[PDB]
């Protein structure tokens, strides 16, 4: 099996930029290289075939180069729509083999998250569980830390965080954090806090609520 290697898996650049994604083969593949774009929704599209040829439909701002074992894709005049993962494929022998992909993030002006905390619902509490939830919406860059504080004391255990893909329209990210514990655990403490630390701010953004209210 020809092994394909995209040494970079993360890539970040501003709109209008030029970006290169590189692809390397375990052995000479004689220009039978194809490039595919997968969108976060998982739809897949061929960009360029046989090193440099453009698939019908594909913008000329897409181009490819290479010989022997080393190949590269070049996206220039970079576009909001180009948020995807880019895959190279060798088409010289069976089985066809693909690279690991390169995720491309579009840069964006820094943005502080809009944070919201929510207490357990009435219904869940009947069910005997209790989950406190925290949205941290529309921020950049993606890098961010969340702490849960129960009666001031930090909580690591039982926290579920979930990030979204970079927004295809405004280039932001969002995240939900969920602290789950039993109804009894919940009911044995008064205040629940959600601290966000992020580039945009020197001190955390803190939201919380108090059961005694």
């Amino acid at each position: 099996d020809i092994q394909m290697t995209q040494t970079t898996s993360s890539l970040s650049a501003s709109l209008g930029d030029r970006v290169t994604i590189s692809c390397r083969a375990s052995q000479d593949i004689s220009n039978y290289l194809n490039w595919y774009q997968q969108k976060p929704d998982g739809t897949v599209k061929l960009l360029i075939y046989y090193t440099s040829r453009l698939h019908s439909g594909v913008p000329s701002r897409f181009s490819g180069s290479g010989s022997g074992t080393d190949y590269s894709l070049t996206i220039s005049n970079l576009d909001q729509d180009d948020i995807a993962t880019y895959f190279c494929q060798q088409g010289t022998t069976l089985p066809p083999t693909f690279g690991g992909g390169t995720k491309l993030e579009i840069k964006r002006a820094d943005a502080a998250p809009t944070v919201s905390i929510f207490p357990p619902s009435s219904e869940q509490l009947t069910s005997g569980g209790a989950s406190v939830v925290c949205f941290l919406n529309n921020f950049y860059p993606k890098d961010i830390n969340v702490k849960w504080k129960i009666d001031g004391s930090e909580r690591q255990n039982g926290v579920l965080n979930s990030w979204t893909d970079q927004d295809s329209k405004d280039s932001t990210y969002s995240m939900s954090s969920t602290l789950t514990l039993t109804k009894d655990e919940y009911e044995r403490h008064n205040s629940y806090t959600c601290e966000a630390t992020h580039k945009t701010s020197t001190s955390p953004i803190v939201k919380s609520f108090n059961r005694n209210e």
């Binding site: 039978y32 194809n34 595919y36 929704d41 998982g42 739809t43 897949v44 599209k45 061929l46 075939y49 046989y50 698939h55 993962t85 895959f87 494929q89 088409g91 010289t92 069976l94 089985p95 066809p96 083999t97 693909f98 690991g100 992909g101 809009t114 919201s116 905390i117 929510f118 207490p119 357990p120 619902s121 219904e123 869940q124 069910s127 989950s131 939830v133 949205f135 919406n137 579920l160 979930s162 990030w163 979204t164 969002s174 995240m175 939900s176 969920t178 789950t180 609520f209 108090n210 209210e213």
Partner: protein, 219 residues
């Protein structure tokens, strides 16, 4: 105008076989080209499985050739995959695709992919919990609300919102395994002047369990 779409069961018990169908439209599977099964495993590692030519020629990935069978039905213009003895390693999103038969070996049309899970874990409907601000939490310019969809299996879930305003930004957060069962969530933001005036409710559809709940969100 060539289109492929795959379909089949999303959940399959270890040791059983997995059957999928791709349905081609806009093009006869007999005219020309090769028709392929691929899959993408966790960690985005993309693996070709096999094809069936327009002439009926078949070829498999050596790694899989003990357990794989591709067939076709030219009457219905369909092709099929069958992968025997599935383990959990066989959990992936499966993809049908059309390619050059030979020459450049390029996939020029793809299905959207279909996610299949291998587990003995029982199908379960979700619990849907509303997320409204704590009553003391007086707010400002607009308001965020959400659903919590918890304790379900398998993926996936659709969450859709209704309110009044098409100035509603939604976010859907990818699901996560919480001790055997999944959990996901969704946020919506609305002008603070439209709520609690204009009712807001979410709709959480879980096909595997064939279930839909709608939670209204109260102040």
């Amino acid at each position: 105008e060539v289109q492929l779409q795959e379909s089949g069961p999303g959940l399959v018990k270890p040791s059983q076989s997995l059957s999928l169908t791709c349905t081609v439209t806009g093009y006869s599977i007999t005219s020309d080209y090769a028709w392929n099964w691929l899959r993408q495993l966790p960690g985005n590692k993309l693996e070709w499985m096999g094809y069936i030519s327009y002439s009926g020629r078949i070829r498999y990935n050596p790694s899989l050739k003990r357990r794989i069978s591709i067939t076709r039905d030219t009457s219905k213009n369909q092709f099929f995959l069958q992968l025997n003895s599935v383990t959990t390693e066989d959990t992936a999103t499966y993809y049908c695709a059309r390619s050059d038969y030979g020459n450049y070996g390029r996939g020029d049309y793809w299905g959207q992919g279909t996610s299949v899970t291998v587990s003995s874990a029982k199908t379960t409907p979700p619990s849907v919990y509303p997320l409204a601000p704590g009553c003391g939490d007086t707010t400002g310019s607009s308001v965020t609300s959400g659903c919590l969809v918890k304790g379900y299996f398998p993926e996936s879930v659709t969450v859709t919102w209704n309110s009044g305003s098409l100035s509603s930004s939604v976010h859907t957060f990818p699901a996560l395994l919480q001790s055997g069962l999944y959990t996901m969530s969704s946020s919506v933001t609305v002008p603070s002047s439209t709520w609690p005036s204009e009712t807001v409710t979410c709709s959480v559809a879980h096909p595997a369990s064939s279930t839909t709940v709608d939670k209204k969100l109260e102040p």
